[model samples]
Target: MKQFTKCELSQLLKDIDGYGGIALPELICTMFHTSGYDTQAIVENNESTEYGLFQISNKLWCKSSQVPQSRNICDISCDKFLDDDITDDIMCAKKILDIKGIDYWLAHKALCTEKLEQWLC
Candidate 1:
């Protein structure tokens, strides 16, 4: 079970800083967490856990491939996440995070205040 580390995250950022010259590794992490991947459970999975730092799962291709059975994707992979293919691991990292929860724009919008009737109803 592969797990992501901070060092790997930083390395990914440093490796591909040229893509945008501005690293947002935390953004990647946040999205990974926000995605279907469970942080704590993934980190402790008995099987392959590919969360954070690109969430490269061994059991499944998580880069940018459409994970066929999942309906949400078809067969995405670390390959689809390639901006420069070889030089932008960080960009690749960003690519992975970007796809995830991308369509989930309406799930958890930050409202100024919670609607009581909406919640109650």
Candidate 2:
């Protein structure tokens, strides 16, 4: 995993403003909770696969060679989510937050809210 400095990742999230009227730091806080600022991060969900800074799921969201015949709800290649650019990843994440609320990401529910101060720092 390649970890980004807090400043770098925080700025990227701010530029995207993907939180849909939510606070900027919460978006940064959520991503910090998810991938720890690692663009290339990967986490297996036991029954599924997750990738990239948002920890997007292969089960219902992204398409990956690792997950055969994926549903790919976001209609994007999973590899796109792993890149440093993050535009596409942020787009997809916004769609999720639009429909699923911040709680869609367990990390936000379980971790981010209380850690917002530290993440913003």
Candidate 3:
């Protein structure tokens, strides 16, 4: 598992085109609250599980044999989100943001909506 610091993550996002203009600071803030920038982060909920730096849900975003009835909107395996490479995770997160906006992430809704100066370079 690779744990990224805020600076490293910000640079990586920039290299990936800032996640299609979803606001780098807000995205960074959300990542912190979601999984503390850990690449292999996973959290199991009652009905679904979250995976990766963005903590994307298996319920509607990705597919996993462990999680039945997943919508698989990202057309990706949930395990893909847990790798050290975050390119796929960023891509899937962008899809979610386009359809659902930042509200797709509970951490963004709860904590990243305001006071985001700390996440900026």
Candidate 4:
């Protein structure tokens, strides 16, 4: 079993939220665990699926030229997501949760909330 320690998990979680505040860190870890197996399965199968603590979908990758399918969301998203003309990181996660259902909303439900469109306003 390939295991990332709690500290490593925290670092990845921090990469997502950038500030490493409350609930979100735990939520990200839960989300990662949920997606980990399927992601690994895809990796093992040698499919073109995205793999990581965040099971990024190829659909979103095609949607956003700024968001490549590389193992670099933590860096790319930090700079481009908020400003990119197409899909942002949160939007990508939103679409992934809708399609794959590996949710990161263990706290305030990011899905089904007006949060995305709300922020776009």
Candidate 5:
């Protein structure tokens, strides 16, 4: 898995213009808190785990052979998230933003609260 530098990830998300006007700084900080750009990361949380570059959730966002009775909000396969391509991941993340706003991610509320300037640079 490739770990994108802050600058590189910023470039990729340039067109995103934030999730529902989330702002670039908040977006970058959120991504940093989430996966640190680890495309293949599968992080375990309580009751479920998050996956991919954005750390999308298996119980709510994606469906997989490993996760049964998943709601699959993004309607995508979990294996696809593990792939190198970030298109699907970004698309699903955007969808989440549309549905829940930037606050949807707990990391954003926890770690990305005060100093967001670091992610911009």
Candidate 6:
């Protein structure tokens, strides 16, 4: 797994247009809360699993073999989110941000909204 530092991840996100109108610090902060910058991070929940840097959920966002009835809103395999390359993850995250807003990520409400300066590159 590739583990990214905050500065490295922030620069990469900037280059790839990851913010999509949301503040970059907030996005980075939420990612830290979600996956701790690990490219291959996977956290199992009671009903679904979260994958990769953005912790995109298999139940509603991506298809996974373990989740046979997923909605697959991102139209990609959940496996794709667990790779070293994060382009797909960023794009899918933007899609979620567009449809559901930043609140889709619980971290944003719980931790990222305040003290975002620490997440800045």
- Scored by TM-score, the top model is 6
The window of 10 residues in a row where model 1 has the poorest summed lDDT is 112-121
Better model by lDDT: candidate 3 vs candidate 5: 3
* Candidate 4 lDDT by residue in tens digits, 5-92: 5454455445444323324444444544444323232222243344333444343332334335554423343334323232354456
- TM-score ranking, high to low: 6, 5, 3, 2, 4, 1
lDDT of each: 0.36, 0.77, 0.85, 0.40, 0.83, 0.86
Q: Residue-wise lDDT of candidate 1 within 1-121, one digit each (tens)?
A: 2244544444544544344332334333333443332222333245444433334443444432233333223234544332223233334344544565322222223421233232210
Please provide, for model 2 over 1-121, each residue's C-alpha lDDT reduced to its tens digit, 9 standing for 90 to 100: 5577777777767665545567767777777778877879888877787888888988878887778777787899998988877889888888787877777788776766664777664
Which candidate model has the greater lDDT, 2 or 5? 5
For model 5, which pairs clash? none
Question: RMSD of each candidate?
Answer: 11.3, 2.2, 2.0, 11.8, 1.6, 1.9
The worst-scoring run of ten residues by lDDT in candidate 3 lies at: 14-23
Q: Which has the higher TM-score value, candidate number 4 or candidate number 6?
A: 6
Q: Better model by lDDT, 3 or 6?
A: 6
What 10-residue stretch in candidate 4 is worst by lDDT?
112-121
Q: What is the C-alpha RMSD, rounded to one decimal, of candidate 6? A: 1.9
Q: How many pairs of residues in model 4 come into backbone collision?
A: 0
- Pairs in steric clash, model 2: none
Model 1: lDDT equals 0.36
Q: After superposing candidate 1 on the true structure, give the runs of residues whose Cα lies further than 4 Å from its correct spot.
A: 28-32, 35-121
Considering summed lDDT, which 10 consecutive residues are worst modelled in model 2?
12-21
| After superposition, candidate 2 runs with Cα above 4 Å error | 15-18
Report the Cα lDDT for candidate 4.
0.40
Worst 10 residues of 6 by lDDT: 13-22
